[PDB]
Paper text:
Acinetobacter baumannii produces the catecholate siderophore acinetobactin to scavenge iron, a nutrient essential for several metabolic processes. The biosynthesis begins with BasE, a standalone adenylation domain, which activates and loads 2,3-dihydroxybenzoic acid (DHB) to the phosphopantetheinyl arm of the PCP domain of BasF. Adenylation domains have two subdomains, a large N-terminal subdomain (Acore) and a smaller C-terminal subdomain (Asub), which is highly dynamic, adopting unique conformations to carry out each individual step of the adenylation reaction. Several binding pocket residues were identified within 5 Å of the ligand, including Asn242, Phe243, Ser247, Val336, Val344, and Tyr346.
The V336A mutation that expands the binding pocket of BasE near the C4 position of DHB, resulted in a ∼13-fold improvement in apparent kcat/KM for 4-fluorosalicylic acid and a ∼76-fold improvement for 4-methylsalicylic acid. We first generated a casting of the binding pocket of WT BasE and compared its volume to V336A. We observed a significant expansion of the pocket near the region where the valine to alanine mutation was introduced, suggesting that the methyl group of 4-methylsalicylic acid was better coordinated into the mutant binding pocket as a result of this extra space. The V336A mutant bound to 4-methylsalicylic acid and the V336G mutant bound to 4-aminosalicylic acid were used to compare with the binding pocket volume of the WT enzyme. All three structures were solved in the P212121 with two molecules per asymmetric unit. No density was observed for the dynamic C-terminal subdomain, as observed in the prior BasE structures. Next, using the protein atoms from the refined structure of V336A as a search model, the structures of V336G and V336A/S247C were solved.
Residue numbers in the entry: 3 to 437
The structure:
Amino acid sequence: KQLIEFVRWSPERAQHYRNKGYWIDQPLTRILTVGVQSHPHSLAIICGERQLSYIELDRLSTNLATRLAEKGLGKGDTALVQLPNVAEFYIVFFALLKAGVVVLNALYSHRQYELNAFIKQIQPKLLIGSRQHEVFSNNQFIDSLHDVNLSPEIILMLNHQATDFGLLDWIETPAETFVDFSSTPADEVAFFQLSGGSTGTPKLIPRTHNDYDYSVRASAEICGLNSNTRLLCALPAPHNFMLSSPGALGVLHAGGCVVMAPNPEPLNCFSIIQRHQVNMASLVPSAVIMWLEKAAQYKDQIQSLKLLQVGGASFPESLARQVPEVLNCKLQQAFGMAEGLVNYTRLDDSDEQIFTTQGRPISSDDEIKIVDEQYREVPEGEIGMLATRGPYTFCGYYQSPEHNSQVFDEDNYYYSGDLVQRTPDGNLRVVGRIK
Ligand SMILES: Cc1ccc(C(=O)O)c(O)c1
Ligand SMILES: [Ca+2]
Ligand SMILES: [Ca+2]
Ligand SMILES: [Ca+2]
Ligand SMILES: [Ca+2]
């Protein structure tokens, strides 16, 4: 009966974020509902040979939602999803948003240790994975959950076996009966993001409809997405970078099309880029380097690329300058975190800004502090610890009041651990990490 708990923004901040237009109090499904009304037959997802229109995506995720509702899964319930980079991932995502099930998307690279940690934390009644994944190749993991009174009520499986509930079977057919369902309320939790760089298992980050949709809508505008955008999704679909900054969600928000890749391997990616005339991609520096090593041989396959986001790790100026020279597309640098704050270089920034900085916050109401060890602000220019709060930055990890007291100060700034300096033009330079 009780919605998943989380740490709320103050009412004065919530009102402000509504007054500014950031929070519009719509569920994340808004992206899909609006696309369906404006352009139902535009492509939403390209995945191998498949083409999913906006309305196909809408129908398929509604189907799964009705089947989960039929089974008693809804508001108050949680789900663990571990899917590879395929269209089913987004059908499942929009199905759980529609049903009011708070979902944690594990990384496809996560193994038993992490999944066990996640299951113990959110006690999901729904588990969705793939039989092709190492963990579900047999039934030992699924069986172990019973031994700890932690079995889900329902397990759905991609590449299922006969005795399994087939994920595609629950997606292709709506439920026989009708049960009502609805999203969690817009200022309540929609799903769980996962921390990056945390010591042990990644910590759970509750994200509400309001704050996630805002960061999606604002990123989309800042990266110039429109209905012609075709964005390669080669990083892990669940990752904050690939899902929302601007990510698949940002492209759906703009009415465009996401184009799937299993991973960033250059030759397969180059092929997909040529086959579907991909014009945007988002990569971490290690993958950029892999593409740089092969781009000259395949200039022709990747010509249609227009814009590359790069972030997630150190990206020195000398590498950045190769992007336009070798990959033949504009560069956009980003520095974000699944906890909230996302920075982009702007499309009209100077070349020095794009090449030597990681940009500036999405929102004019992102508040930044850069502090020393005595937590006093450093003089402009100097290196400090980054602390931040804003209309899409969380207020605390799930069920972690001890840790939360350590990484938030009295004014509820979040201390991300990143070291940064603010350049004279106003942009940020990510310079290292701190314990
Ligand atoms: C835009 C962006 C870039 C990097 C990350 C990250 O977490 O590494 C992110 O969340 C968002
Ligand atoms: Ca189709
Ligand atoms: Ca639009
Ligand atoms: Ca190009
Ligand atoms: Ca961090």
